[PDB]
Amino acid sequence: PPLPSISISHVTSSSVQLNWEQYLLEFRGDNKDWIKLHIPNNRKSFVLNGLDSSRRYQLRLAAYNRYGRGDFAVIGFTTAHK
């Protein structure tokens, strides 16, 4: 089970877009507990909406197969202002 290569874009005051090449996606406000996100299969991108502005978050993604999941690829970001 491999390590996804993830890429962030479209960083707004309330959302970010993740791109990469079953999954487990989680996010958290900085230093808080992780929240598991629903993402459908056969998706290669994901828009996380509903975030606060000017705030630090982390996203992490791991890939799944029948044997289990791999390690998490993590990205920290700060949403835009206003």
Residue numbers in the entry: 495 to 515, 527 to 587
Lines quoted from the article behind this entry:
Recently, a shortened Dscam (sDscam) gene family with tandemly arrayed 5′ cassettes in Chelicerata species has been identified, which encodes ∼50–100 isoforms. Chelicerata sDscams could be classified into two subfamilies, sDscamα and sDscamβ, containing one and two variable Ig domains, respectively. Crystal structures and cell aggregation assays demonstrated that both α and β subfamilies of sDscam used Ig1 for the isoform-specific trans recognition in a hand-in-hand manner. Furthermore, the cis interactions were established by the three FNIII domains of sDscam, which assemble into a cross fold with a kink between FNIII2 and FNIII3.
We found that FNIII2 alone but not FNIII1 or FNIII3 could promote cKIT tyrosine phosphorylation, suggesting the essential role of FNIII2 domain in mediating sDscam cis interactions. The gel-filtration analysis supported our observations in the crystal structures: Ig1 mediated the formation of trans homodimer and all the three FNIII domains were involved in the cis interactions.
